[PDB]
Design a protein around this ligand. Structure first.
Ligand SMILES: *[C@H](/C=C/CC(=O)CCCC(=O)O)C/C=C\C/C=C\C/C=C\C/C=C\CC
Length: 256
């Protein structure tokens, strides 16, 4: 029954809206100028950055520490969303922890695309915007840490998914039966089979005129992995270059 599927879809959408305070729908209204009260302050160089701090320890480290604390905040939000996915909380405790460990970054990059256009990225709950060119001009190694998230986002945003599509997608990501070290793969695969079915219906109904959207979006999951791997390689370099800079405990266990 596709009705059971549309009900799963609506439940996931509703949890997503409750769990994440900056939706894609809000992010697009900020970025495309449906605003007199929604316009961001734009940071594109060093003075506007200082100006920024006032209207909202080198600079590359500050930005990077800022990104750290925002991923941790995202993790907490993703962790709340996951508990809402039917069956997730009934899984073995170890598998819950495994699924979140490998899933949280794929989800963060997916949702990050909603805050991006080819020119920059919304920051600080949409009150700021930081240009892609300013991010790329930071001292090495930090200079090109965001470049591949931007290249991902231009491609992924061309799919034109909205929040209700993303809610099912992100659920499909967490419920991955092939994560290393999973004790009990079958209960996961059954949850994910049901999600895949919901996603397939959602995309058919929400994008009737968009041939094979479902398959194209599943192929994107490969780009996400590639983003994670590069990013882990970049973290090993930072570890050795700055012995004074501190990864956040929550993030250190994820990566461990
Ligand atoms: C920050 C996003 C970085 C993503 C990463 O790859 C790093 C995450 C670490 C990890 O989980 O591996 C770039 C996006 C927006 C700008 C972020 C911060 C700019 C400065 C301030 C923003 C507002 C408040 C910061 C506390």
């Amino acid at each position: 029954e596709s009705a059971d599927l549309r009900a799963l879809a609506k439940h996931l959408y509703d949890s997503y809206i409750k769990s994440f305070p900056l939706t894609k729908a809000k992010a697009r209204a900020i970025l495309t100028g449906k605003t007199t009260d929604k316009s961001p302050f734009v940071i594109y160089d060093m003075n506007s950055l200082m100006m920024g701090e006032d209207k909202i320890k080198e600079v590359a480290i500050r930005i990077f520490q800022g990104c750290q604390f925002r991923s941790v905040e995202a993790v907490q939000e993703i962790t709340e969303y996951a508990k809402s996915i039917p069956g997730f909380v009934n899984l073995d405790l170890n598998d819950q922890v495994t699924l979140l460990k490998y899933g949280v970054h794929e989800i963060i990059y997916t949702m990050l695309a909603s805050l991006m256009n080819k020119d920059g990225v919304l920051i600080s709950e949409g009150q700021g915007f930081m240009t892609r060119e300013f991010l790329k001009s930071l001292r090495k190694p930090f200079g090109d840490f965001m470049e591949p998230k931007f290249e991902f986002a231009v491609k992924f945003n061309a799919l034109e998914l909205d929040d209700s599509d993303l809610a099912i997608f992100i659920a499909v990501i967490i419920l991955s039966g092939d994560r290393p070290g999973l004790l009990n793969v079958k209960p996961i695969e059954d949850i994910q089979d049901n999600l895949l079915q919901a996603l397939e219906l959602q995309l058919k109904l929400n994008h009737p005129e968009s041939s094979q959207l479902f398959a194209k979006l599943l192929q994107k999951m490969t780009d996400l992995r590639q983003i994670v791997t590069e990013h882990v390689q970049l973290l090993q370099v930072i570890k050795k270059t700055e012995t004074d800079m501190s990864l956040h405990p929550l993030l250190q266990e994820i990566y461990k």
